[PDB]
Amino acid sequence: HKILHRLLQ
Amino acid sequence: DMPVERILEAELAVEDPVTNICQAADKQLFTLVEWAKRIPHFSELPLDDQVILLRAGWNELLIASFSHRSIAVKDGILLATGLHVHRNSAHSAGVGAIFDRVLTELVSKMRDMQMDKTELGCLRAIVLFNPDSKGLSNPAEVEALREKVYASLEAYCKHKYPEQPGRFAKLLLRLPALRSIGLKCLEHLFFFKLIGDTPIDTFLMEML
Ligand SMILES: O=C(O)CCNc1nc(C2CCC2)cc(N2CCCc3ccccc32)n1
Secondary structure (H helix, E strand, C coil): CHHHHHHCC | CCCHHHHHHHHHHHCCHHHHHHHHHHHHHHHHHHHHHCCCCHHHCCHHHHHHHHHHHHHHHHHHHHHHHHHHCCCCEECCCCCEECHHHHHHCCCHHHHHHHHHHHHHHHHHHCCCHHHHHHHHHHHHCCCCCCCCCCHHHHHHHHHHHHHHHHHHHHHHCCCCCCHHHHHHCCHHHHHHHHHHHHHHHHHHHHHCCCCCCCHHHHHC
């Protein structure tokens, strides 16, 4: 879940 | 501390049928991340837990929003793109029955009781802080945050609508309907992905 994990940061 | 005013601020800060549904869902997934970051203490959870909560609840979180958005729409759903879904195109998507459930179990009941935006935001925060989400590092920490949300919700309801003593429980008791509607919507979205009707290379595809 690279996209979700990134947007959260 | 979990002030309903910040939960309202989060709401106000962000707010072919299958192709229209999928495009609007992809658009709102990005919005949903911005919304969750504005819910007090969500971004203080371990990153992996934030991932787990949004993966567990994004379907119900989007349904709750488009349902409330549609309370002044005549027999249909206003998507976040500005396009509508009416009964015909719902059947064309093979989702006629679930569409009817959204209207009778969510939109019409939100309209009837005039659910306001603080209430919607708090219901959505409860959904977000789902302590049954699988693989959380400390499920009870998420339960603790859920309990602070519904404590604040109840106090808000009792202050603003004291002539409706049953209103807090009435709000909470739309969540089983949201849960089963969210399960059925996801089963169709998975089907759309399996047959190749979903835009490829999207945030939406990762969520599925
Ligand atoms: O536009 C927004 O606010 C968010 C994106 N729309 C949007 N999202 C979803 C999310 C819920 C998981 C996919 C579903 C959805 N529908 C529209 C009408 C009823 C229905 C029945 C079955 C399957 C999907 C749907 N529609």
